[PDB]
Design a protein around this motif. Structure first.
Motif, PDB file in Angstrom:
ATOM      1  N   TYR B 140      59.375  27.258   7.314  1.00 48.47           N
ATOM      2  CA  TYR B 140      60.392  27.800   8.013  1.00 48.47           C
ATOM      3  C   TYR B 140      61.691  27.374   7.662  1.00 48.47           C
ATOM      4  CZ  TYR B 140      63.226  29.302  12.037  1.00 48.47           C
ATOM      5  OH  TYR B 140      64.134  29.670  12.879  1.00 48.47           O
ATOM      6  N   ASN B 141      61.837  26.110   7.163  1.00 53.25           N
ATOM      7  CA  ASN B 141      62.795  25.293   6.449  1.00 53.25           C
ATOM      8  C   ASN B 141      63.850  25.777   5.524  1.00 53.25           C
ATOM      9  OD1 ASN B 141      62.030  23.609   9.017  1.00 53.25           O
ATOM     10  ND2 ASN B 141      60.837  22.406   7.244  1.00 53.25           N
ATOM     11  N   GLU B 142      62.710  26.009   4.506  1.00 50.96           N
ATOM     12  CA  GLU B 142      63.393  26.512   3.219  1.00 50.96           C
ATOM     13  C   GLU B 142      63.842  27.973   3.249  1.00 50.96           C
ATOM     14  OE1 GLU B 142      62.914  23.024   3.243  1.00 50.96           O
ATOM     15  OE2 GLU B 142      63.960  23.623   1.447  1.00 50.96           O
ATOM     16  N   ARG B 143      63.094  28.702   4.144  1.00 50.79           N
ATOM     17  CA  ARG B 143      63.653  30.125   4.347  1.00 50.79           C
ATOM     18  C   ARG B 143      64.957  30.051   4.915  1.00 50.79           C
ATOM     19  NH1 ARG B 143      58.094  33.167   4.061  1.00 50.79           N
ATOM     20  NH2 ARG B 143      59.080  35.046   5.051  1.00 50.79           N
ATOM     21  N   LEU B 144      65.107  29.330   6.036  1.00 55.58           N
ATOM     22  CA  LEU B 144      66.375  29.000   6.506  1.00 55.58           C
ATOM     23  C   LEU B 144      67.225  28.608   5.558  1.00 55.58           C
ATOM     24  CD1 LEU B 144      66.996  27.491   9.866  1.00 55.58           C
ATOM     25  CD2 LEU B 144      67.961  26.356   8.150  1.00 55.58           C
ATOM     26  N   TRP B 145      67.000  27.781   4.785  1.00 54.03           N
ATOM     27  CA  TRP B 145      67.864  27.003   3.658  1.00 54.03           C
ATOM     28  C   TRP B 145      68.345  28.287   2.712  1.00 54.03           C
ATOM     29  CZ3 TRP B 145      67.565  26.943  -1.731  1.00 54.03           C
ATOM     30  CH2 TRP B 145      68.208  25.992  -2.423  1.00 54.03           C
ATOM     31  N   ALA B 146      67.499  29.006   2.304  1.00 55.03           N
ATOM     32  CA  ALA B 146      67.830  30.214   1.181  1.00 55.03           C
ATOM     33  C   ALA B 146      68.577  31.301   1.836  1.00 55.03           C
ATOM     34  CB  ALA B 146      66.558  30.528   0.441  1.00 55.03           C
ATOM     35  N   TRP B 147      68.198  31.286   3.097  1.00 56.40           N
ATOM     36  CA  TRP B 147      68.855  32.484   4.114  1.00 56.40           C
ATOM     37  C   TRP B 147      70.406  32.030   4.189  1.00 56.40           C
ATOM     38  CZ3 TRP B 147      71.117  33.940   8.528  1.00 56.40           C
ATOM     39  CH2 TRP B 147      71.314  35.192   8.739  1.00 56.40           C
ATOM     40  N   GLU B 148      70.492  31.031   4.456  1.00 51.46           N
ATOM     41  CA  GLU B 148      71.891  30.358   4.473  1.00 51.46           C
ATOM     42  C   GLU B 148      72.698  30.416   3.334  1.00 51.46           C
ATOM     43  OE1 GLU B 148      73.299  30.361   7.590  1.00 51.46           O
ATOM     44  OE2 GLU B 148      75.060  30.203   6.266  1.00 51.46           O
ATOM     45  N   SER B 149      71.948  29.842   2.139  1.00 49.90           N
ATOM     46  CA  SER B 149      72.542  29.512   0.863  1.00 49.90           C
ATOM     47  C   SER B 149      72.846  30.715   0.467  1.00 49.90           C
ATOM     48  CB  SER B 149      71.745  28.791   0.003  1.00 49.90           C
ATOM     49  OG  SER B 149      71.113  27.670   0.725  1.00 49.90           O
ATOM     50  N   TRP B 150      72.440  31.847   0.376  1.00 49.35           N
ATOM     51  CA  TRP B 150      73.037  33.045  -0.125  1.00 49.35           C
ATOM     52  C   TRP B 150      74.248  33.650   0.572  1.00 49.35           C
ATOM     53  CZ3 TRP B 150      72.496  36.007  -4.426  1.00 49.35           C
ATOM     54  CH2 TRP B 150      72.911  37.376  -4.153  1.00 49.35           C
TER      55      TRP B 150
END
Ligand SMILES: *[C@@H]1O[C@H](CO)[C@@H](O[C@@H]2O[C@H](CO)[C@@H](O)[C@H](O)[C@H]2NC(C)=O)[C@H](O)[C@H]1NC(C)=O
Ligand SMILES: CC(=O)N[C@@H]1[C@@H](O)[C@H](O)[C@@H](CO)O[C@H]1O
Ligand SMILES: CC(=O)N[C@@H]1[C@@H](O)[C@H](O)[C@@H](CO)O[C@H]1O
Ligand SMILES: CC(=O)N[C@@H]1[C@@H](O)[C@H](O)[C@@H](CO)O[C@H]1O
Ligand SMILES: *[C@@H]1O[C@H](CO)[C@@H](O)[C@H](O)[C@H]1NC(C)=O
Ligand SMILES: *[C@@H]1O[C@H](CO)[C@@H](O)[C@H](O)[C@H]1NC(C)=O
Ligand SMILES: *[C@@H]1O[C@H](CO)[C@@H](O)[C@H](O)[C@H]1NC(C)=O
Lengths: 147, 597
Positions: B140-150
């Motif tokens: 969940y954490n890295e999906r949130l990471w990428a979803w914010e980073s874009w």
């Protein structure tokens, strides 16, 4: 009499040259009457009369005032008048040019490949016939009652 | 002395001089797309500049007389599609500013790249860099990471460029007498003058709502079944009365839900069977696929495909001497030249998209008797809509048995069809409310009933209630999210990928019932059926010289979009999903942000 007329058209326009048909070619380029005296011959020539940079040699008339009387050549390419106004040579708008060109290329479809068409219009005169058909026969025998 | 006469002569020269220049541009771009050289780039750009300068000259010539004295509508439709000018009546500074905005917005999105958490060496671009970690992963954490980073990167910088974009596009739209540039986007659906077939640009929008209102409950009977099946998947981040967190749909910004299928497969040891290995085993080839694809269109009784198409198309990648673009595209070059560009491997999916592109090719073959201005679909959404239905016919198991790609002893039961309907409903259903929501947002922002200080609020003010989705991390007015999507930044209308779906489920309703099929619509096909091909080809041959509603009445006998056969296509899914959702709640509560968690 024999008259061999000849030209090259697109593929899809090859049905516009017959007794009866009208359109672009019969009205503005080559009028054949509805009870003419001969035959019409055509065959496909895309391997010869086109090349990969196109070929802009063959032209055709795309503008006229009225139709053609059958079998009437016209070559006069003066600037067409469409609107109601003088033209005096000068143009740009409602003075267009009546001769267009072709753009045959050897990647096209059948509906645009250049077909070669020859028209044989023939009839008798009361002069002696300078054009007969074939005779025929077999062999010649001797010393026999024959016909 | 009249007016129609000079318009007739002008069109008669304009067609002849337009098809030639368009063939020059199309052959240039095809020769680039086969072989990547910069010589082809500069020749293609010179061809495009020639073709655009010609259109500019004819259009600025055309406005010397108005449309209002043409009573043969074939000419008036052409001059109406010609006479719009646009940025030519706009001034010299604003057009350069607008093109600068468009180039900058495209290059920040397209060439953009976000980095890791401290590495310059492994940084992720969009495709295929950023997409895989959000495509198939479980943390969940890295999906949130990428979803914010874009979005936190790209949207904040696209925001003031978007403000300049909307303020210039509205003045440009009122310079062409369509107030609210969205009305200029709706003008392609405008139909006027043909009585009993008339339309309006204002009549469209509520129709979209009046087609959405029956799609609603099925979606929630989908959605809860999605949401409860994310209970065993992400076993902390589930509100059983609530929306969805928008980085869990197995992909990017909420458009396609296919990647959840491996999680949401109902039946375990009863697989949706793919026949790629069947073509592998008994000696196939790439050519046999398109031979059978032609053999399908013989079976409906349509025109076959020209020898000049089989001569110079590309249906196999060139190995490695050259570098070739393989994005599969049906290329109508004009002037009787049709080709298909594809890097086909032995795959069932390439078989299916071979039919999907060959449907486009047949549609291009059909209307090739029109003036050059009128050679397209009747509206923007018809072309892909008629392209789609050959895949739906070709995926049928009995169609695979009749072509020897499935042993004719094989049986089919309900769990196979439920798995197939679910893997179809992840494609078809999920796109519709999101597409409606995004088009509604952009329409409203162009209307100017939402000023600059509510944008990134109002988006989520729709996103919870209509789509059923809650953002996981708080957004303020630094951002701009509708700009994280490819069709937003590239100035593409997004409405068509809604209407397409509705159109396709009329067509399989009207054609395939006429071939006298038994049972459901999802087991239907047009094979060995000539009246279906006649009923279709009486529509494909028209062109766009008619209103699109007449072309719709030619097939179905209605003038509108009816989602009800979409109901009928999805029956066994729905009537089994009710007994699924008998142990849950349907719908969503809208409070539940996971920072009020
Ligand atoms: C890509 O296409 C171009 C042109 O189609 C090729 O470049 C030249 O093409 C001419 C034909 O007009 C040949 O006479 C030259 O020999 C070609 N150049 C070279 C360096 O071979 C080019 O070869 C094609 N790309 C590849 C990888 O073959
Ligand atoms: C499509 C349209 O409205 N045409 C306009 C015309 O009204 C205007 O006079 C001209 C000014 O250059 O720009 C163009
Ligand atoms: C061209 C084609 O596919 N024709 C088919 C034929 O092969 C098949 O035997 C028959 C019965 O199903 O239906 C038809
Ligand atoms: C019911 C029927 O006739 N099915 C035929 C089959 O017999 C034949 O082998 C095949 C190919 O010709 O087409 C189909
Ligand atoms: C004008 O309409 C008539 C029939 O309504 C049709 O015969 C003709 O082709 C039309 N004009 C053009 C230029 O297509
Ligand atoms: C079309 O091609 C198929 C073979 O793919 C052939 O069986 C059929 O007879 C052809 N029909 C026509 C009209 O050419
Ligand atoms: C599948 O079909 C069989 C055969 O009729 C039936 O017994 C079974 O209940 C069906 N299963 C489902 C889930 O519909």
């Amino acid at each position: 009499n024999v008259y061999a007329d000849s030209f090259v058209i697109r593929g899809d326009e090859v049905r516009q040259i017959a007794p009866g048909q009208t359109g672009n070619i019969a009205d503005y380029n080559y009028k054949l009457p509805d009870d003419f005296t001969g035959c019409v011959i055509a065959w496909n020539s895309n391997k010869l009369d086109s090349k990969v940079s196109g070929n802009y040699n063959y032209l055709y008339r795309l503008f006229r005032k009225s139709n053609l009387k059958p079998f009437e050549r016209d070559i006069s390419t003066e600037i067409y008048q469409a609107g109601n106004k003088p033209c005096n040579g000068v143009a740009g708008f409602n003075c267009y040019f009546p001769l267009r060109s072709y753009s045959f290329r050897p990647t096209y479809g059948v509906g645009h490949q250049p077909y070669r068409v020859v028209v044989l219009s023939f009839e008798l005169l009361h002069a002696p016939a300078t054009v007969c058909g074939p005779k025929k026969s077999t062999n010649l025998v001797k010393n026999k009652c024959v016909n | 002395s009249t007016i129609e006469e000079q318009a007739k002569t002008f069109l008669d020269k304009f067609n002849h001089e337009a098809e030639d220049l368009f063939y020059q541009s199309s052959l240039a771009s095809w020769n680039y797309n086969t072989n990547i050289t910069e010589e082809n780039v500069q020749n293609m750009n010179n061809a495009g500049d020639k073709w655009s300068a010609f259109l500019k000259e004819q259009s600025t010539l055309a406005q010397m007389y108005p449309l209002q004295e043409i009573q043969n509508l074939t000419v008036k439709l052409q001059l109406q599609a010609l006479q719009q000018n646009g940025s030519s009546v706009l001034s010299e500074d604003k057009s350069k500013r607008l093109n600068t905005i468009l180039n900058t917005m495209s290059t920040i999105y397209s060439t953009g790249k976000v980095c890791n958490p401290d590495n310059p060496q492994e940084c992720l671009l969009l495709e295929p860099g950023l997409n895989e970690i959000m495509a198939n992963s479980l943390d969940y954490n890295e999906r949130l990471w990428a979803w914010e980073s874009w979005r936190s990167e790209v949207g904040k910088q696209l925001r003031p460029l978007y403000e300049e974009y909307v303020v210039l596009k509205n003045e440009m739209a009122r310079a062409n007498h369509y107030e609210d540039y969205g009305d200029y986007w709706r003008g392609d659906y405008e139909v006027n003058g043909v009585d009993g077939y008339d339309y309006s640009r204002g009549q469209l929008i509520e129709d979209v709502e009046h087609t959405f209102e029956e799609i609603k409950p099925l979606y929630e009977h989908l959605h809860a079944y999605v949401r409860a099946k994310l209970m065993n998947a992400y076993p902390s981040y589930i509100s059983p009365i609530g929306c969805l967190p928008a980085h869990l749909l197995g992909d990017m910004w909420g458009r396609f839900w296919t990647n959840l299928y491996s999680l949401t497969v109902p039946f375990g040891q009863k697989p949706n069977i793919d026949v790629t290995d069947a073509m592998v085993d008994q000696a196939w080839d790439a050519q046999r696929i398109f031979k059978e694809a032609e053999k399908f269109f013989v079976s409906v009784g349509l025109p076959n495909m020209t020898q000049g198409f089989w001569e110079n198309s590309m249906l196999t990648d060139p190995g490695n001497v050259q570098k070739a673009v393989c994005h599969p595209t049906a290329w109508d070059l004009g002037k009787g030249d049709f080709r298909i560009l594809m890097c086909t491997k032995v795959t069932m999916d390439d078989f299916l998209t071979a039919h999907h592109e060959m449907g486009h090719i047949q549609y291009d073959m059909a209307y090739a008797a029109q003036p050059f201005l009128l050679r397209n679909g009747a509206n923007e959404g018809f072309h892909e809509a008629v392209g789609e239905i050959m895949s739906l016919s070709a995926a049928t198991p009995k169609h695979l048995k009749s072509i020897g790609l499935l042993s004719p002893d094989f049986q089919e039961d309900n769990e196979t069809e439920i798995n197939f309907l679910l893997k179809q409903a992840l494609t078809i259903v999920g796109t519709l409310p999101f597409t409606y929501m995004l088009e509604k947002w952009r329409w409203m922002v162009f209307k100017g009933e939402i000023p600059k200080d509510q944008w990134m609020k109002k988006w989520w003010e729709m996103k919870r209630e209509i789509v059923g989705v809650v953002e996981p991390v708080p957004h303020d007015e630094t951002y701009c999210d509708p700009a994280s999507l490819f069709h937003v930044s590239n100035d593409y209308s997004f409405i068509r990928y809604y209407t397409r779906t509705l159109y396709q489920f009329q067509f399989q309703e009207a054609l395939c019932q006429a071939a006298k099929h038994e049972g459901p619509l999802h087991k239907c096909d047009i094979s060995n059926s000539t009246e279906a091909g006649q009923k279709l080809f009486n529509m494909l041959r028209l062109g766009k010289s008619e209103p699109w509603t007449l072309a719709l009445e030619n097939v179905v006998g209605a003038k509108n979009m009816n989602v009800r056969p979409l109901l009928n296509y999805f029956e066994p899914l729905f009537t089994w999903l009710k007994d699924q959702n008998k142990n849950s709640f349907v719908g969503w509560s809208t409070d539940w942000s996971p920072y009020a968690d």
